[PDB]
Subunit: 254 residues, 4 copies
C-alpha cells in the first residue's frame, strides 16, 4: 500500500510527539489503504551553525518514540548519524533513515542493514539517480530486504535544490521510492511549492511521500519555514490518494 511518512522534524519533546502522533493515528484510522509511519529526529547532527538546536539526545529521543509506538501502535522511523547508533535505534525504529549527506557512508548503511530493520536512504543532493543502484546493493549485501530511496532534491547552483522527477522511474528499478515533499523545496524553502510538487510526485508515480508536519510550524525549533501545519495534513493526503487513483493507471511497468 501507499506509504505516508510524517511527523515533526525534531523531537522537541515527547509532548509534541504525542500530539502529532494523535493526529497521525486519527488519519491512519481514516485512511486504511495507507501505511503511516511516524517520523522524528532525535538529533539534527548536520546543522550549519554550531549555535543551532540539535535536540535532547538519543536516549530522550528513543524514549519519546517508544511512547508514540506504545500509545498509538504506529510504526516508527528516525535517522542515524554514526554506525554505533543503529542497534539502539533499531529497538524502536521500524525503518532506519540514512541522512542525505551520509548516503555513501558504507559502514553506516551496513550498520543499519545489520539490525534487520527496513532502511530508507535519503538520496544525496550530489547523487545522480542511476548511482543509487550501488546504494541498494550495499544494503542488500548487508542483509537488508526492505529498502527505500527518498528523493529530496538535487544541487542546482548555490543555495537551491531542484527536483528532477525523472529520478522517480529510474530509482524504482531497484527500490521502493519515497518523495520528500518538505526538504525538496528547501533552500540550502518556500511552503508555497510543497503541495504542487507532491501532486507531481504522485502523478509521476512513487511508493510513498515523506512530510514534516508540526502543530505550529512558526514555533517549531527546526524547519519553521517548510514544516506543514498539522491541520493541513488530512487534505493533502486525500488529494494525493485521489490523484494516485486516477494516475496509477498510467504508471510505467518497472
Amino acid at each position: 500500500k501507499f506509504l505516508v511518512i510524517a511527523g515533526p522534524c525534531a523531537i522537541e519533546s515527547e509532548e509534541l510527539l504525542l500530539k502529532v502522533g494523535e493526529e497521525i493515528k486519527r488519519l491512519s484510522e481514516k485512511f486504511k489503504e495507507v501505511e503511516f509511519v511516524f517520523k522524528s529526529s532525535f538529533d539534527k547532527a548536520n546543522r550549519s551553525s554550531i549555535h543551532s538546536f540539535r535536540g535532547h539526545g538519543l536516549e530522550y529521543g528513543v524514549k519519546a518514540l517508544r511512547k508514540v509506538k506504545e500509545e498509538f501502535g504506529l510504526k516508527i522511523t528516525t535517522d542515524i548519524h554514526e554506525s554505533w547508533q543503529a542497534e539502539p535505534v533499531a529497538e524502536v525504529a521500524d525503518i532506519i533513515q540514512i541522512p542525505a549527506f551520509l548516503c555513501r557512508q558504507t559502514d553506516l548503511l551496513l550498520a543499519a542493514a545489520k539490525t534487520g530493520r527496513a532502511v530508507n536512504v535519503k538520496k544525496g543532493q550530489f547523487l545522480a539517480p542511476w548511482d543509487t543502484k550501488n546504494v541498494v546493493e550495499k544494503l542488500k549485501f548487508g542483509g537488508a530486504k526492505e529498502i527505500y530511496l527518498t528523493e529530496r532534491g538535487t544541487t542546482f547552483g548555490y543555495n537551491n535544490l531542484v527536483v528532477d522527477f525523472r529520478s522517480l522511474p529510474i530509482m524504482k528499478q531497484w527500490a521502493k521510492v519515497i518523495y520528500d515533499a518538505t526538504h525538496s523545496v528547501q533552500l540550502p524553502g518556500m511552503r508555497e511549492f510543497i503541495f504542487p510538487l507532491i501532486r507531481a510526485a504522485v502523478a509521476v508515480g512513487c511508493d510513498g511521500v515523506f512530510m514534516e508536519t508540526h502543530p505550529e510550524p512558526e514555533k517549531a525549533l527546526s524547519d519553521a519555514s517548510t514544516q506543514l501545519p498539522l491541520s493541513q495534513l488530512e487534505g493533502i493526503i486525500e488529494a494525493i490518494l485521489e490523484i494516485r487513483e486516477v494516475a496509477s493507471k498510467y504508471y510505467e511497468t518497472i
Copy 2:
C-alpha cells in the same frame, strides 16, 4: 478554461506530412471538445547544431503549407519566427506566433510579434530563471500583445542535460498563461521514456496547456527523431492528461 494542446510535426518536411498530422489532430479536436487544439510546425529550424542538418523549405513554402492545414481542417495555427521581418508574413496564417527559447530576450523580435495583433508564445530560455519571465511579458504587453503564453521547456543542468523545475509553473502563472513543452524538456542538448511521466507531473502541478511534437514515424523525422511522439500515441496521452487535470484541478492554487 479550455485546455490548450499545441501539437504537430517538428518541421514542415512537406505539405503532405502536415495534412496527415492535421487530419488526426482534427479528429481528436472533434472527440476532445473541451480542448483547444493548435496545429504547430516550423517552416525553419534556424538554430540546428550542425550546418549539415535539415532546416526546411523556406518561409513561403511553410506558410503556404500551414495555410492549407488551416483551410482544410479549420485548425488554429502556430509557428516560430527567427528575425523581426518574419513576423508580418507569418502573422497572415499564424494564430499564435512562437518565439524560440534562445531568442526569448531579443527585444525587436518580441516587439515584431506583438504588433501583429496575434497571440504570442515565448519559449522560456534554458538560461532564464522563472521570475525573469515577468519582464518578457512586460515587453510583449508594451508592444501590443493581448494574449501571451510562456512555455516551460527545461533549464540548463550541467552539460547536455535539461531539468524541469516544476516550481516554474506556478511562478510564471503570476503573469501569463503557462504551457508545458513535453517533448523538448527531456531532450539531451532525447529520452522518450520520460515524456509521459513528466507531462503527468505538469498537469498535476497545473498548467494552461501542453506542447507536443508528433510525427507519423518519428524514426524517419528530419528533426528531433528521438523525441517526437508517434502520432498514434497522441490520443491516449491527451486522454490521460485530461483525466489527471480533472482530478487535480480542485487543488490548483489561486495566483
Copy 3:
C-alpha cells in the same frame, strides 16, 4: 600575438568612445606585443527590461566607431543581432561579434562570415565546450577564416554563471579562444572577481582577453557594476602579460 579587446559596453556617445579610444591607443603604443581591438555595442538588443538603455542606433554607432578607427588607427569590433546588420557593420568592424544567446543562429553566423571579416562568437551560457566545434564549422562553411570563441560563463543554477576553465583547452582545438573577464562574473556581477579570474585565464592559457572598461563605471549607462575603471586597465594588462610570459611555458600542445 596576445589579443586585448576592450572598450565601453555601449556607445553612450562617440564622445565617450574617443576618450576610451585615446587610452587604448596609449596602451597599444606601450604594449607593442599586444593586438588591441576597440569594442563597443551600438545596441543592447537583449536587455531584460523594455525600459532599459539600448543605445543610439546602428547608424550613430557605426559613425562613432568610424571616428575611433580614423582618429586612432585601432581595429574595431562590435556585435550584430540580425543578419541584415552584418554588411553595414562590416564596413568598420574588423571583427564581427556574435552575442551569446545567438551563437546557434545559423543565418546570423553565415551573414557575418560572408562579410569576409573575422568573427568572434560568444559561447552561449547553455552551450557545452565541445559543442562549439559545430559553431566553428558553420563559420568555415560560410567563408570565415579568422574565427574566435569567447568564454563568458555557463548557467549555474538561477541568476549565476560559473566559469569552467576546462573550456579553454577544449575550445582551443578548433579556434582561437578569448576570455571575457567582465561578463563571466556577472549575475544574470562582482567586480572583486574580475582580476582573479583573468589571472586564472592566462595561467590556463588563452589567445586573448575581453574587458569592458569605462572612465566612470558608476555613471555608465550599462554594466555600471562590472565595467572596469579605465585607469585600472594598464595595470591589469601588465599583470596578465607577466603571468602569461611565465605560464606559457606550460601551455599544453593544441
Copy 4:
C-alpha cells in the same frame, strides 16, 4: 608564507607503497625548501560507490604505516577520519586531520577533530556554497581548532560532473587558509588532462596550498587510478606552480 603541498597515494595500499612515495616527497622537500610538505594517505575509503571496491587495511595498519613514514622521513602527516571515535587514535600520528567532503557538515566529527589539538582541513562539500564554509570554520574554532584549512574540490554541476568555481578561493580566504585539490576537482563522480591547467589557475588566483594524489603507477592504483598523478611528474608540477605563484603573487588581493 610557506606554500603547502599535501601529497601522497590516495589509499594506503601497503606500507611499502607509502615508503616509496615518502622517499620522493622527502627528496622534493629538500629541493623545494620554500614549501611545507605534508604526506597524505587514507587508511580507509569509507565512501566508495561500490561495496566491491577497495577500502583499505584498517585504521591500526594505516596509522602504523603513516607513523613509519613520519619516523623514516621526518614528514608531517595527514589522513581523513569518518566517525568521531577515529579522531583520537588518528591524532597520535596526524599533524592535520582531514574531514571528507560529504561529512563537512557533521558537527560531532568536526568537534572530535578540533579537540585533538591538531590542525584540521575540511574538504568543501560538492553541495556547499563558498560563503557557507564560514559556519564550518566557526564550528571548528568553537571546538578548539587553531589551525584550519578549507579545501576546494569542485561543486556539483549536473550529473556526474564537477566544476571548479574559482571565486571560492578568495571567498573562503576570508575565514581560513585555502587549499586547492588538484586531483578530485576533475574526477567525474577522471579527466587527467585538466589537472595541470586547473592547478595553474588555482595558483594564479591565489591559494595557500595544493592537494595532489600521486602514485608510482596510477594505472595500478586500487582507488582513483584515473586521477592520481604519476609520481615522476610531481616535481615538474610543483616547480611550475611555484613559478606561477611567484609571478602572480604581487597581484593577490588583500582579504
